[model samples]
Target: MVTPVNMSRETALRIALAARALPGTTVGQLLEILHQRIEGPLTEESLQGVSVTDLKIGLAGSEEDVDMLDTPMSALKDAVRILWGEAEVDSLPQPV
Candidate 1:
């Protein structure tokens, strides 16, 4: 079974910053992109051992499947930026 791994608070902040910086991107959207790109054609076996918490913690490690969690933080961050694009205030006005 997939267990929840601990992502540093710094990681969360980084993801949040990236998400906020990009327009029309939510954390969930970033996460979905990350998963699709990183996981790449998941199978039942790949998903069998995964858990919601595992997804939440960005943990894909389990003996029963491949773990995208093994990727480096820098690569992950770059992927996030590329997939979501950098956030820009001038792109749109806030909903105040």
Candidate 2:
């Protein structure tokens, strides 16, 4: 039931690839790591109702034409972290 709000298919694929590239990790594990990395220390409260699809890219604002497809992995991760903090993803409740 994961759905990206604004990220492209390729972006999702790239995230999957990055997750797989990490040793001894599944997509879910990697996603958990990513969630912690973005959200801070892991806890029942922190992990409450979190899901992979909630970690999508893009926001409703001036649409910049930056080529996310060509962006490097490090840069992409940084952006995701930034956006996650800005959007207060860790504090959000589960979608109803």
Candidate 3:
């Protein structure tokens, strides 16, 4: 069975950016992760339905606090921050 999802553009962008930033993860790999972990496509609505914990686990590949194989803990934390709307503003470079 499939469920519907409602999400904002900001949230969708955050997820996209975080997924792109994930170490050694390709576009197809991300699509597969979301498809399997999220059980849907990579559309905004589909991504909107994915919970922070699920995204974190899917990105880190483990639920424990220990180190990850492909993604670092800090990197995973940053991804969660992006999902939670708590990401650092200073991550962007200042304009000259």
Candidate 4:
């Protein structure tokens, strides 16, 4: 089994997360986009077993998130930039 890297892909995927051309975005679309960007030390087999469906099993389709798809791209981008500028990527895979 591919070792699961204890990291995430939020800021590193700015270009992919951008909804510039689309009138709006959805959780499903965002989900698909995120899967595309999760890489580097993270392998396809790393989380190949985990299903996004399971992750969102609790959250109903109608339930709104704090920063749901309705949130404007500018706002999301603003928040994203804030996190990108403030956060640090310190935990990558350790050398064996």
How high is the lDDT of residue 70 in model 3? Answer: 67
Q: Backbone clash tally for model 3? A: 0
Ranking by lDDT: 3, 1, 4, 2
In terms of lDDT, the poorest run of 10 residues in model 4 is: 54-63
Give a tens-digit lDDT track for model 4, residues 1-90: 756443455533432343332235433343343355645453333334443332232123332452353544344433333323332444
Alpha-carbon error at 40 in model 2, in Å? 16
Candidate 2: where are CA atoms >4 Å away? 1-3, 34-96
Q: What RMSD value applies to candidate 4?
A: 14.0
Segments in model 4 whose C-alpha atoms lie over 4 Å from true places = 1-33, 36-68, 87-96
Error of 3 at 34 (Å): 8.9
TM-score of each: 0.31, 0.29, 0.44, 0.22
Backbone collisions counted per model: 2, 0, 0, 0
Clashing pairs in 4: none
The runs of at least 3 residues in candidate 1 whose Cα sits more than 4 Å from the true structure, single-residue gaps closed, are 1-4, 35-96
lDDT of 2 by residue, 9-75 (tens): 5434444454433333344543443433454333223433443333322211112432232333344
How accurate locally, in lDDT, is each candidate? 0.41, 0.37, 0.54, 0.38
